[PDB]
């Protein structure tokens, strides 16, 4: 039951852990949050169990002294913890970005909680915070709850964030929908491809097709809910490019790629 690791980033994983904090926000919005710390390279952190899954690997190669061990027989270990304290510890960590590099934190799996230590300097101040909830479950419950089980037929490549007006356009659509209270997506294979989004009501009809198509069958009409704002927020991903795919007229993905930390969030009909 020894789960110890040190988090210390310099250039690349700072934005990545900020994205982890955003995932912690949406997981706090989510009903449940589970973790599957396994081995040292591939550690999945898909916290969901509406009808969304957020499969995304953690490249712990840059991390120093990370080990996992438990009594779960096989290499798979169930781990569920409340992420409300994760938000607090992450924002207190983000507050000290002015100075302090050797402080970091060390979290260990104790028999009652998970203590986190700080060594910030204003003459040093030590902070100790224990994780309240760490309720584990059976390995059978883990193996009967598995993501993916999907195919790919019509991929919709999406342009890198070098064009800031693109994510700005989708943010504008999101706030337009919020102000004016379904989000119908469409895509065509007519070559560069065209991306069109449609929202309709009894007396309301708005459709947006983003001009200047640089994004890389046809007539795929899909009706879905308004839970795509989390994907719109996740699209930021300033480090690298984000992909996407929509097909089967009932399912749509959001493949964020940031050592390849592939992040995919699942959407149902």
């Amino acid at each position: 039951m020894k789960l110890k690791l040190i988090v210390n980033g310099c250039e690349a994983p700072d934005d990545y852990k900020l994205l982890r904090t955003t995932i912690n926000t949406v997981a706090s919005l989510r009903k449940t949050a589970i973790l599957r710390f396994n081995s040292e390279r591939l550690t999945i952190i898909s916290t969901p169990k509406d009808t969304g899954q957020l499969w995304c690997t953690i490249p712990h190669d840059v991390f120093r002294l990370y080990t996992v061990i438990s009594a779960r027989e096989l290499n798979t270990i169930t781990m569920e913890c409340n992420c409300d304290s994760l938000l607090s510890v992450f924002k207190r960590y983000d507050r000290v970005m002015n100075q302090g590099s050797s402080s970091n934190m060390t979290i260990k799996l104790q028999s009652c909680a998970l203590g986190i230590t700080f060594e910030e300097i204003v003459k040093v101040i030590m902070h100790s915070f224990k994780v309240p909830v760490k309720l584990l479950f059976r390995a059978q419950d883990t193996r009967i709850q598995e993501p993916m089980i999907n195919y790919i037929q019509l991929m919709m490549y999406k342009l890198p964030p070098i064009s800031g007006e693109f994510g700005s356009a989708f943010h504008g659509f999101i706030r337009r929908v919020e102000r004016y209270s379904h989000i119908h997506l469409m895509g065509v294979k007519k070559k560069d491809v065209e991306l069109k989004i449609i929202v309709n009501e009894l007396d309301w009809h708005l459709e947006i097709c983003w001009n200047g198509p640089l994004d890389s069958s046809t007539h795929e009409v899909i009706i879905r809910c308004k839970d795509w704002k989390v994907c719109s927020k996740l699209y930021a991903a300033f480090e690298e490019v984000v992909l996407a795919i929509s097909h089967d007229e009932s399912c749509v993905f959001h493949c964020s790629l940031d050592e390849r930390g592939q992040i995919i969030y699942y959407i149902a009909r």
């Binding site: 356009a169 309301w204 009809h205 947006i208």
Partner: protein, 193 residues
């Protein structure tokens, strides 16, 4: 498309539409498309009728492909249009190109707005069942009582001074004199006196 029109300077269109919002914002505008241009008419309680006309040279891509008597009518709700346009046409110098479309009859009024690689498209379904046609509060020029031409700024100042006073009933005076001391005023009575 039967009717098509494109513009690049939406400030003129929005400042013309802002002059129709005090009473015409509710609904029931009867847009006209002809060779002359684009016109909007609003009439409530059959007491006042307004006509705002847009010329051919205002639009940059006026085509007007038709093979009929050259007079098609459509009635659309103004409030939906205002609610749609309020969020867009923001900031300044956004070069928002507006495209107008209407497929004769049975098709919604289509507006296309593009703003910095971001496009919008709103369809306005029309109402053409109980359109009694004709209408119009017209007058004959052979028996005009009097004619007057006044500056816009002076009339605007006079009306903005008159509004907050009250004066639920107003009067219009006309008078001409031999010494070129013409008299024209808009007096009124209120609780103030």
């Amino acid at each position: 498309n039967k009717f098509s029109a494109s513009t690049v300077h939406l400030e003129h269109i929005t400042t013309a539409l802002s002059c129709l919002t005090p009473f015409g914002s509710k609904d029931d505008v009867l847009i006209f498309i002809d060779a002359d241009g684009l016109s909007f008419v609003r009439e409530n309680n059959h007491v006042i009728k307004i006509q705002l006309l847009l010329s051919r040279e205002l639009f940059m891509s006026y085509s007007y492909r038709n093979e009929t008597e050259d007079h098609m009518k459509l009635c659309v709700k103004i409030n939906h249009i205002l609610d749609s346009v309020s969020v867009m046409n923001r900031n300044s110098d956004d070069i928002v190109e507006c495209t107008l479309s209407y497929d004769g009859h049975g098709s919604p009024f289509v507006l296309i707005f593009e703003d910095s690689f971001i496009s919008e498209r709103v369809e306005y379904s029309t109402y053409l069942i109980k359109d009694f046609d004709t209408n119009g509060l017209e007058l004959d020029r052979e028996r005009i009582s009097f004619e007057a031409i006044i500056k816009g700024e002076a009339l605007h100042s006079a009306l903005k001074d008159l509004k907050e006073i009250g004066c639920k009933e107003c009067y219009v005076y006309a008078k001409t004199e031999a010494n070129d001391e013409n008299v024209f005023a808009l007096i009124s009575k209120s609780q103030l006196g």
